[PDB]
Scaffold this active site. Sequence first.
Site, PDB file in Angstrom:
ATOM      1  N   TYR A   9     -79.328 -21.390 -31.571  1.00 30.46           N
ATOM      2  CA  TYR A   9     -78.621 -21.184 -30.304  1.00 30.46           C
ATOM      3  C   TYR A   9     -79.809 -20.681 -29.594  1.00 30.46           C
ATOM      4  O   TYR A   9     -81.091 -20.661 -29.947  1.00 30.46           O
ATOM      5  CB  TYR A   9     -77.622 -20.049 -30.260  1.00 30.46           C
ATOM      6  CG  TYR A   9     -76.857 -19.925 -28.887  1.00 30.46           C
ATOM      7  CD1 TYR A   9     -76.257 -20.921 -28.629  1.00 30.46           C
ATOM      8  CD2 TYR A   9     -77.061 -18.581 -28.293  1.00 30.46           C
ATOM      9  CE1 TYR A   9     -75.316 -20.842 -27.516  1.00 30.46           C
ATOM     10  CE2 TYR A   9     -76.464 -18.495 -27.068  1.00 30.46           C
ATOM     11  CZ  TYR A   9     -75.657 -19.593 -26.622  1.00 30.46           C
ATOM     12  OH  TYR A   9     -74.797 -19.503 -25.493  1.00 30.46           O
ATOM     13  N   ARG A  15     -72.688 -17.456 -26.180  1.00 27.08           N
ATOM     14  CA  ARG A  15     -71.540 -18.149 -27.096  1.00 27.08           C
ATOM     15  C   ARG A  15     -71.886 -18.046 -28.673  1.00 27.08           C
ATOM     16  O   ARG A  15     -70.851 -18.351 -29.588  1.00 27.08           O
ATOM     17  CB  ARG A  15     -71.306 -19.533 -26.804  1.00 27.08           C
ATOM     18  CG  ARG A  15     -70.693 -19.846 -25.563  1.00 27.08           C
ATOM     19  CD  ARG A  15     -70.347 -21.355 -25.278  1.00 27.08           C
ATOM     20  NE  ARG A  15     -69.640 -21.596 -24.005  1.00 27.08           N
ATOM     21  CZ  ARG A  15     -69.541 -22.018 -23.037  1.00 27.08           C
ATOM     22  NH1 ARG A  15     -71.031 -22.501 -22.688  1.00 27.08           N
ATOM     23  NH2 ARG A  15     -68.618 -22.443 -22.109  1.00 27.08           N
ATOM     24  N   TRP A 105     -72.329 -21.690 -15.596  1.00 28.17           N
ATOM     25  CA  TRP A 105     -73.610 -21.374 -16.277  1.00 28.17           C
ATOM     26  C   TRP A 105     -74.725 -22.256 -16.034  1.00 28.17           C
ATOM     27  O   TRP A 105     -75.724 -21.756 -15.899  1.00 28.17           O
ATOM     28  CB  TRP A 105     -73.403 -20.834 -17.569  1.00 28.17           C
ATOM     29  CG  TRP A 105     -72.285 -19.960 -18.083  1.00 28.17           C
ATOM     30  CD1 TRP A 105     -70.974 -20.327 -18.498  1.00 28.17           C
ATOM     31  CD2 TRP A 105     -72.476 -18.445 -18.027  1.00 28.17           C
ATOM     32  NE1 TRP A 105     -70.348 -18.897 -18.665  1.00 28.17           N
ATOM     33  CE2 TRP A 105     -71.056 -18.003 -18.477  1.00 28.17           C
ATOM     34  CE3 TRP A 105     -73.141 -17.600 -17.674  1.00 28.17           C
ATOM     35  CZ2 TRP A 105     -70.837 -16.551 -18.379  1.00 28.17           C
ATOM     36  CZ3 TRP A 105     -72.925 -16.378 -17.554  1.00 28.17           C
ATOM     37  CH2 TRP A 105     -71.737 -15.702 -18.206  1.00 28.17           C
TER      38      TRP A 105
END
Lengths: 200, 200
Positions: A9, A15, A105
């Site tokens: 990530y 998330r 986002w």
Amino acid sequence: GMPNYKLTYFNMRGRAEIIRYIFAYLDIQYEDHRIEQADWPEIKSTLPFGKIPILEVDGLTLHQSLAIARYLTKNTDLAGNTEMEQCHVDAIVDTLDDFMSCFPWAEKKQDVKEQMFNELLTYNAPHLMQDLDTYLGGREWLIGNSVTWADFYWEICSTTLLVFKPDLLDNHPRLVTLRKKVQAIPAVANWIKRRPQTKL
Amino acid sequence: GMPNYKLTYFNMRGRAEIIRYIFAYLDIQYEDHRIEQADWPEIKSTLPFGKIPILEVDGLTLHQSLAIARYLTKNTDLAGNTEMEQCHVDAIVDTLDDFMSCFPWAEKKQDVKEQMFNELLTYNAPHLMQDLDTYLGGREWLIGNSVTWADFYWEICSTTLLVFKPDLLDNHPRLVTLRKKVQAIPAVANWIKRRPQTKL
Ligand SMILES: CC(C)(O)[C@H]1CC[C@H](NC(=O)N2CCc3c(cnn3-c3cccc(F)c3)C2)CC1
Ligand SMILES: CC(C)(O)[C@H]1CC[C@H](NC(=O)N2CCc3c(cnn3-c3cccc(F)c3)C2)CC1
Ligand SMILES: N[C@@H](CCC(=O)N[C@@H](CS)C(=O)NCC(=O)O)C(=O)O
Ligand SMILES: N[C@@H](CCC(=O)N[C@@H](CS)C(=O)NCC(=O)O)C(=O)O
Ligand SMILES: [Mg+2]
Ligand SMILES: [Mg+2]
Ligand code: NA
Ligand code: NA
């Protein structure tokens, strides 16, 4: 032997954090691989669906943060107790995830992004807080009589929202109490101390 | 005996159809309660989170279409035959639901709605179709060696997308074939024949 876990990530909670909370709580060792945004376009082309986070399990790659979270918590104490309560867990998670996913986002026009963020936080977010407050009532956890990963996701999503709207939960002390209880869980509390400090 | 099932949604396939496919395939009797927009505000006030579809199981109310679909398929051959395959099913469904959820279904201005639809279908839908075609390859179903509700959801989402972009699968005959295989399943074919014809 033990499965080899590698999570990929950005350097954020975002998330991926729900997966990190779950690993910490289940005392599962994993590689917390964090990639820079400038190197993202190049690794994006290598992923089946071109999105992160992904979780690699012994040579096999998984995707979709909530699909991964459900897989890791299946038959654990973080999953719903009854099959019915597992439905409520999934449904609360998707209710939270629906709202967070509404935020743009990735919007490239900054002014457009600010306008939608402010609209969602000024109008939509207070109504959702009220629905959640009524849903929780006076119960200790969101679903059942013990903590589930829905409680984790509430604390993770509310932490994000509180960055952009600090007064969000001024009128919802019971929702705050739930956040503090998740944060006080020993494995979770330890992760919160040693996790890299990021804005989001 | 059998549990009494009552599904509530608008008169359209929309987010309820996946549940309807699962009931048909499992040969489960249920009330397919379809409400006109006029009957929606009074029902909305009764729902903890004010959104449909909902499913009442022996008088207990569930929400979130995909939470409900997962609940109805647990312990059936539609769920996936292994734990990691169940994760892949969840992942594909969420990938499809992510994209469908991007469309502004409730935008009030018809011009801005058509622009955003056109943008999504032109510059974003192709990427996803190619990702899905590559993920499928020469295999019979999206996950495993038997049909799962992820194949149902592909057929349902692609049916909607094809309404707005008829040439979406011109270059993906294997994805067309997967749709035809889902539509040929006797219980699914029967439901497609009997269901009300709506645009969405
Ligand atoms: C490199 C590029 C294109 O410029 C990107 C644009 C998107 C940014 N991405 C974020 O900044 N974030 C991810 C989503 C998110 C944040 C915080 N929470 N959160 C979240 C959590 C659960 C569900 C959900 F839908 C969203 C922050 C990261 C840089
Ligand atoms: C009351 C008001 C404002 O008048 C609303 C406007 C939006 C309408 N709503 C739709 O028109 N639709 C729902 C979403 C949808 C359609 C088709 N598929 N689909 C779908 C399926 C799976 C996932 C997903 F995100 C979306 C059409 C329902 C009435
Ligand atoms: N619903 C998916 C969302 C995946 C997603 O969109 N991730 C973002 C980062 S938060 C991403 O990949 N951004 C880069 C891109 O879209 O190319 C999940 O929860 O994993
Ligand atoms: N992710 C949710 C979406 C719930 C949702 O927003 N449903 C829409 C209809 S497609 C709705 O409730 N519209 C009426 C309203 O929200 O007032 C699900 O799959 O159930
Ligand atoms: Mg496992
Ligand atoms: Mg979702
Ligand atoms: Na199967
Ligand atoms: Na085409």
